[PDB]
Design a protein around this motif. Structure first.
Motif, PDB file in Angstrom:
ATOM      1  N   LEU A  90       0.842  -1.188   0.000  1.00 39.50           N
ATOM      2  CA  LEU A  90       0.000   0.000   0.000  1.00 39.50           C
ATOM      3  C   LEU A  90       0.880   1.241   0.000  1.00 39.50           C
ATOM      4  O   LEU A  90       1.890   1.290   0.711  1.00 39.50           O
ATOM      5  N   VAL A  91       0.485   2.252  -0.779  1.00 39.83           N
ATOM      6  CA  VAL A  91       1.214   3.515  -0.769  1.00 39.83           C
ATOM      7  C   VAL A  91       1.177   4.104   0.636  1.00 39.83           C
ATOM      8  O   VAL A  91       0.133   4.119   1.299  1.00 39.83           O
ATOM      9  N   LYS A  92       2.324   4.580   1.104  1.00 38.91           N
ATOM     10  CA  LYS A  92       2.470   5.047   2.473  1.00 38.91           C
ATOM     11  C   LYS A  92       2.291   6.560   2.515  1.00 38.91           C
ATOM     12  O   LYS A  92       3.022   7.291   1.844  1.00 38.91           O
ATOM     13  N   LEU A  93       1.311   7.020   3.287  1.00 41.14           N
ATOM     14  CA  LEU A  93       1.114   8.444   3.531  1.00 41.14           C
ATOM     15  C   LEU A  93       1.998   8.855   4.704  1.00 41.14           C
ATOM     16  O   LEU A  93       1.783   8.413   5.837  1.00 41.14           O
ATOM     17  N   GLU A  94       2.984   9.712   4.432  1.00 38.87           N
ATOM     18  CA  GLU A  94       3.964  10.116   5.434  1.00 38.87           C
ATOM     19  C   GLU A  94       3.496  11.299   6.272  1.00 38.87           C
ATOM     20  O   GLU A  94       3.688  11.302   7.492  1.00 38.87           O
ATOM     21  N   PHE A  95       2.901  12.311   5.649  1.00 43.49           N
ATOM     22  CA  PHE A  95       2.409  13.483   6.361  1.00 43.49           C
ATOM     23  C   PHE A  95       1.118  13.963   5.718  1.00 43.49           C
ATOM     24  O   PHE A  95       0.865  13.708   4.537  1.00 43.49           O
ATOM     25  N   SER A  96       0.296  14.648   6.510  1.00 38.84           N
ATOM     26  CA  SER A  96      -0.892  15.299   5.979  1.00 38.84           C
ATOM     27  C   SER A  96      -1.141  16.584   6.752  1.00 38.84           C
ATOM     28  O   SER A  96      -0.883  16.656   7.957  1.00 38.84           O
ATOM     29  N   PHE A  97      -1.647  17.594   6.050  1.00 40.88           N
ATOM     30  CA  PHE A  97      -1.982  18.873   6.668  1.00 40.88           C
ATOM     31  C   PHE A  97      -2.816  19.681   5.684  1.00 40.88           C
ATOM     32  O   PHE A  97      -2.984  19.302   4.522  1.00 40.88           O
ATOM     33  N   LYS A  98      -3.353  20.796   6.172  1.00 41.31           N
ATOM     34  CA  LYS A  98      -4.181  21.676   5.361  1.00 41.31           C
ATOM     35  C   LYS A  98      -3.886  23.125   5.727  1.00 41.31           C
ATOM     36  O   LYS A  98      -3.266  23.418   6.753  1.00 41.31           O
ATOM     37  N   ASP A  99      -4.329  24.036   4.867  1.00 42.49           N
ATOM     38  CA  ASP A  99      -4.282  25.466   5.156  1.00 42.49           C
ATOM     39  C   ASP A  99      -5.553  26.089   4.581  1.00 42.49           C
ATOM     40  O   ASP A  99      -6.530  25.392   4.285  1.00 42.49           O
ATOM     41  N   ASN A 100      -5.543  27.411   4.394  1.00 48.58           N
ATOM     42  CA  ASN A 100      -6.764  28.107   3.993  1.00 48.58           C
ATOM     43  C   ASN A 100      -7.282  27.644   2.640  1.00 48.58           C
ATOM     44  O   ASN A 100      -8.495  27.658   2.407  1.00 48.58           O
ATOM     45  N   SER A 101      -6.394  27.244   1.738  1.00 43.32           N
ATOM     46  CA  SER A 101      -6.777  26.972   0.357  1.00 43.32           C
ATOM     47  C   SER A 101      -6.763  25.499  -0.017  1.00 43.32           C
ATOM     48  O   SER A 101      -7.672  25.043  -0.718  1.00 43.32           O
ATOM     49  N   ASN A 102      -5.762  24.737   0.431  1.00 43.81           N
ATOM     50  CA  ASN A 102      -5.504  23.406  -0.101  1.00 43.81           C
ATOM     51  C   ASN A 102      -5.408  22.365   1.007  1.00 43.81           C
ATOM     52  O   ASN A 102      -5.179  22.682   2.177  1.00 43.81           O
ATOM     53  N   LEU A 103      -5.576  21.107   0.607  1.00 46.24           N
ATOM     54  CA  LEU A 103      -5.209  19.951   1.411  1.00 46.24           C
ATOM     55  C   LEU A 103      -3.868  19.428   0.912  1.00 46.24           C
ATOM     56  O   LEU A 103      -3.534  19.575  -0.266  1.00 46.24           O
ATOM     57  N   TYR A 104      -3.102  18.804   1.804  1.00 44.58           N
ATOM     58  CA  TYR A 104      -1.757  18.342   1.475  1.00 44.58           C
ATOM     59  C   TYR A 104      -1.589  16.913   1.958  1.00 44.58           C
ATOM     60  O   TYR A 104      -1.740  16.637   3.153  1.00 44.58           O
ATOM     61  N   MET A 105      -1.249  16.015   1.038  1.00 47.63           N
ATOM     62  CA  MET A 105      -1.016  14.606   1.341  1.00 47.63           C
ATOM     63  C   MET A 105       0.393  14.267   0.867  1.00 47.63           C
ATOM     64  O   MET A 105       0.624  14.051  -0.328  1.00 47.63           O
TER      65      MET A 105
END
Length: 324
Positions: A90-105
């Motif tokens: 399975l692809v490993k998600l290392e970090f995740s976060f968001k800000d005012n505009s975008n999601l980040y994976m």
């Protein structure tokens, strides 16, 4: 021993499923190397962690586009599953976060393209080549099903091949945690199990049907049920009649006859022995299951104006993506 390893994996999965991790990094901790591509919701960038120095693939999802394309639920569901699962294929998600505009994976960097492209570049796979890949899906579905997850989106486009030559499953938008039945029509028609088309409800057994279709296409170069219109593909799927190429081995044809079983109560993977009816089939006689899990088997095949990321002053779609 296999039962107790899955029991420990489910406990670990339930902990992160119950309390998903959020905001495990921020945008200014990464150096932007180059944009690898522009996609549906945003861009994918090769990045370097400033401290650790490791390289990652950062997916940037414009929250406004995700809402317009009606992909809010799929996005949150994929992120919740990825931050809670842990398995070699399975692809490993290392970090995740968001800000005012975008999601980040922030994903682990995997160069080597999708299986669909390679399949159209080579044509078809030799049975040992296909078995190597099929064995990985078997272990992957054994893992996901033990978590009560129906993958229900198995297709060559969702299977990447890494530089080591191994499979990594990528798209988890449709994956649903189900203990009984479910009804939502989703997935590519060529891989739909008959009980999905008949709309009478389905369970984890549709994944084993999809594996049957996948093994056929890899070994034949074309899927078992195909036509110009989806309604014709549906008829061929429900009819169940399958024609095998001459070069198909006797063992391969027997496995496919049991995976492509129209009656889900007779389908391999859905019997009392579960996944072991597949692992102990003659077609997998040469397969070292533990070695595949350990990534020890040698792989059969091994594969500029940058734009800025604009973060608006206004919070965009805060209500929709609160859990991200």
């Amino acid at each position: 021993a296999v039962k107790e390893f899955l029991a420990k994996a489910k406990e670990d999965f339930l902990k992160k499923w119950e309390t998903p991790s959020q905001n495990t990094a921020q945008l200014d901790q990464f150096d932007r190397i180059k944009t690898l591509g522009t996609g549906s919701f945003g861009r994918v960038m090769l990045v370097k962690h400033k401290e650790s120095g490791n390289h990652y693939a950062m997916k940037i999802l414009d929250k406004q586009k995700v809402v317009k394309l009606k992909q809010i639920e799929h996005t949150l569901n994929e992120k919740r599953i990825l931050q809670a699962v842990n398995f070699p294929f399975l692809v490993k998600l290392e970090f995740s976060f968001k800000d005012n505009s975008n999601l980040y994976m922030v994903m682990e960097y995997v160069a080597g393209g999708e299986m669909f492209s390679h399949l159209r570049r080579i044509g078809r796979f030799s049975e040992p080549h296909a078995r190597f890949y099929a064995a990985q899906i078997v272990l992957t579905f054994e893992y996901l099903h033990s978590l009560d997850l129906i993958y229900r989106d198995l297709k060559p486009e969702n299977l990447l091949i890494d530089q080591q030559g191994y499979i990594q499953v990528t798209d988890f938008g449709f994956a649903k945690r189900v203990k009984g039945r479910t009804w939502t029509l989703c997935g590519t028609p060529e891989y739909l199990a008959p009980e999905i088309i008949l709309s009478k409800g389905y369970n984890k057994a549709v994944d084993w049907w999809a594996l049957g279709v996948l093994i056929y296409e890899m070994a034949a170069g074309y899927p078992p049920f195909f036509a110009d219109q989806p309604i014709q593909i549906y008829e061929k799927i429900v009819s169940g009649k399958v024609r095998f190429p001459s070069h198909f081995s006797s063992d391969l044809k027997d496995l496919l006859r049991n995976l492509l079983q129209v009656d889900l109560t007779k389908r391999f993977g859905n019997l009392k022995n579960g996944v072991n009816d597949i692992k102990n089939h003659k077609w997998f006689a040469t397969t070292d299951w533990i070695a595949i899990y350990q990534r020890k088997v040698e792989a059969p095949f091994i594969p500029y104006e940058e734009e800025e990321i604009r973060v608006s002053i206004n919070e965009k779609c805060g209500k929709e993506f609160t859990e991200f």
